[PDB]
Design a protein around this motif. Structure first.
Motif, short mmCIF file in Angstrom:
data_model
loop_
_atom_site.label_atom_id
_atom_site.label_comp_id
_atom_site.label_asym_id
_atom_site.label_seq_id
_atom_site.Cartn_x
_atom_site.Cartn_y
_atom_site.Cartn_z
N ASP A 28 -0.69 -7.00 6.30
CA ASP A 28 -1.86 -5.17 5.92
C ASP A 28 -0.49 -4.59 5.97
O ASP A 28 -0.35 -3.32 5.42
CB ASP A 28 -2.57 -5.16 7.06
CG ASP A 28 -1.59 -4.62 8.10
OD1 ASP A 28 -1.65 -5.27 8.92
OD2 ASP A 28 -2.78 -3.90 9.26
N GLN A 29 0.51 -5.17 6.57
CA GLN A 29 1.67 -3.94 6.42
C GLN A 29 2.63 -4.33 4.94
O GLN A 29 3.43 -3.04 4.81
CB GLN A 29 2.60 -4.43 7.46
CG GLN A 29 2.40 -3.68 8.98
CD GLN A 29 3.10 -3.94 10.23
OE1 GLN A 29 4.52 -3.58 10.04
NE2 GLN A 29 2.97 -4.98 11.01
N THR A 54 7.01 -9.92 1.04
CA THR A 54 7.81 -9.37 1.74
C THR A 54 7.38 -9.71 3.46
O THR A 54 7.78 -9.74 4.16
CB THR A 54 7.09 -8.12 1.66
OG1 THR A 54 7.23 -7.90 0.22
CG2 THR A 54 7.58 -6.63 2.95
N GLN A 110 12.46 0.11 -3.84
CA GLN A 110 11.76 -1.20 -3.61
C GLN A 110 12.57 -2.47 -3.57
O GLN A 110 12.75 -3.37 -2.45
CB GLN A 110 11.00 -1.60 -4.70
CG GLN A 110 9.55 -3.11 -4.40
CD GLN A 110 8.12 -1.85 -4.05
OE1 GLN A 110 8.33 -0.82 -3.36
NE2 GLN A 110 6.81 -2.60 -4.22
N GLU A 136 2.35 -5.28 0.69
CA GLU A 136 1.21 -4.88 -0.43
C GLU A 136 1.25 -6.76 -1.00
O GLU A 136 0.54 -7.21 -0.95
CB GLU A 136 1.47 -4.49 -1.54
CG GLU A 136 1.16 -4.76 -2.63
CD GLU A 136 0.46 -3.99 -3.64
OE1 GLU A 136 -0.55 -3.49 -2.53
OE2 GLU A 136 0.20 -3.29 -4.15
N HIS A 137 2.57 -7.50 -0.95
CA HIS A 137 3.09 -8.83 -1.24
C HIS A 137 3.40 -9.75 -0.35
O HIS A 137 4.18 -9.22 0.82
CB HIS A 137 3.95 -8.48 -2.03
CG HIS A 137 4.23 -7.57 -3.25
ND1 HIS A 137 4.88 -6.06 -3.83
CD2 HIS A 137 2.60 -7.44 -4.27
CE1 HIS A 137 4.01 -5.79 -5.05
NE2 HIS A 137 3.55 -6.84 -5.02
N1 LIG Z 1 -2.10 -2.73 3.15
C1 LIG Z 1 -1.35 -1.94 1.89
C2 LIG Z 1 0.09 -2.16 2.66
C3 LIG Z 1 0.37 -1.10 1.64
C4 LIG Z 1 2.21 -1.22 1.44
C5 LIG Z 1 2.74 -0.92 3.11
C6 LIG Z 1 3.96 -0.54 2.40
O1 LIG Z 1 4.95 -0.05 2.18
N2 LIG Z 1 5.13 -1.60 3.17
C7 LIG Z 1 6.67 -1.67 3.89
C8 LIG Z 1 6.69 -2.05 5.05
C9 LIG Z 1 8.02 -2.67 4.50
C10 LIG Z 1 9.17 -3.31 5.17
C11 LIG Z 1 9.83 -4.02 4.85
C12 LIG Z 1 9.85 -3.86 3.65
C13 LIG Z 1 9.23 -3.69 2.72
C14 LIG Z 1 8.32 -3.12 2.97
C15 LIG Z 1 7.36 -2.36 2.52
C16 LIG Z 1 7.23 -2.78 1.17
C17 LIG Z 1 7.35 -2.89 -0.20
C18 LIG Z 1 8.75 -2.62 -0.25
C19 LIG Z 1 9.72 -3.38 -1.27
C20 LIG Z 1 8.79 -4.74 -1.36
C21 LIG Z 1 7.44 -4.87 -1.10
C22 LIG Z 1 6.98 -4.64 -0.50
C23 LIG Z 1 5.65 -4.51 -0.10
O2 LIG Z 1 4.87 -3.94 0.17
O3 LIG Z 1 5.15 -5.93 0.02
O4 LIG Z 1 6.94 -6.11 -2.07
C24 LIG Z 1 8.04 -6.40 -2.89
O5 LIG Z 1 9.38 -5.45 -2.52
#
Ligand SMILES: NCCCCCC(=O)N[C@H]1Cc2ccccc2/C1=C\c1ccc2c(c1C(=O)O)OCO2
Ligand SMILES: NCCCCCC(=O)N[C@H]1Cc2ccccc2/C1=C\c1ccc2c(c1C(=O)O)OCO2
Ligand SMILES: [Cl-]
Ligand SMILES: [Cl-]
Lengths: 146, 146
Positions: free
Chosen positions: B111-112, B118, A39, B114-115
């Motif tokens: 929507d791509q 990001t 993450q 969670e936070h």
């Molecule tokens: N509808 C809800 C969507 C659910 C999540 C979908 C998903 O896997 N996103 C990827 C795509 C993506 C593309 C680029 C970077 C991160 C992410 C993602 C997650 C993520 C990863 C680390 C983080 C995050 C998030 C975050 O998701 O913010 O937050 C701080 O460190």
């Protein structure tokens, strides 16, 4: 070559310092994180790729190479994710030398900052400005490529 | 001109998005923070100045201009701290347009992720790569200056 970066994870004060090195210039970006997770690495790479033209990343270990979250970030940002195996053995030593140098600078500034993250960013500043400088080299390399 | 940046603070989801714009190129860096404080602004500027050659910062408001912590960071990093008064009135509108554009991109990616943080970094990526691109312009400008 202009688009190649190497990830590097080092430890200090019970915390983790995640570093991205632009291999051709020695320019770095770095952040303090509580622990190296997929993450954290994914988010760090997203930040890096929005700021510089990151084509290839040599990952720092097998866990980050395997991480589905890191793979998702690399896909999103158009980064080719590669291993970081030092096929050329002078890689190990150069990363080692950089970690030692960074920790030295951190020690030289540590008392000017309440928080480690601040000291790390001071170290990034000093490293990238130190005299060409790494900051000058990365800009010249990318400009020439464009 | 190659070293001039403008601070910009905008709001979304009850949170604050702090933006630095490289005035000559339109290139940005941004972060989500809980609220705009001198402490947050100071740390943000330290990060920015370690990564790009920041000579002058036009601060986003009088509180950050006055902040002793922001002044300390600007001193440390060799940044000339200036006001951000739009003596040229087309400044207001350009920053306004940028905030609208950034919020639009954030909505397109929200929507791509969670936070929010990001989504904001995704927006930084899209903004700086959008076609020259802002990322290409900043590198060319600085390379020419060097
Ligand atoms: N509808 C809800 C969507 C659910 C999540 C979908 C998903 O896997 N996103 C990827 C795509 C993506 C593309 C680029 C970077 C991160 C992410 C993602 C997650 C993520 C990863 C680390 C983080 C995050 C998030 C975050 O998701 O913010 O937050 C701080 O460190
Ligand atoms: N051990 C004695 C420490 C006394 C602190 C002296 C002091 O004001 N430093 C300035 C210098 C400086 C130069 C550049 C940037 C920050 C700072 C400082 C503080 C600071 C500010 C924001 C932050 C911080 C810190 C931090 O202090 O880390 O942490 C996250 O956001
Ligand atoms: Cl620099
Ligand atoms: Cl870019």
């Amino acid at each position: 070559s202009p688009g190649i970066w190497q990830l590097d994870c080092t430890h200090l004060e019970g915390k983790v310092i995640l570093v991205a090195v632009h291999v051709a210039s020695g320019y770095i970006e770095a952040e303090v994180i509580p622990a190296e997770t997929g993450q954290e690495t994914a988010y760090f790479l997203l930040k890096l790729a929005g700021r510089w033209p990151v084509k290839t990343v040599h990952t720092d270990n097998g866990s980050n190479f395997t991480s589905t979250t890191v793979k998702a970030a690399c896909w999103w940002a158009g980064i080719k994710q590669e291993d970081g195996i030092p096929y050329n053995p002078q890689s190990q030593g150069v990363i080692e030398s950089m970690n030692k140098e960074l920790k030295k600078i951190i020690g030289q500034v540590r008392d000017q900052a309440e928080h480690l993250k601040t000291a790390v960013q001071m170290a990034v500043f000093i490293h990238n400005h130190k005299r060409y400088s790494a900051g000058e080299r990365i800009v010249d390399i990318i400009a020439t490529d464009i």
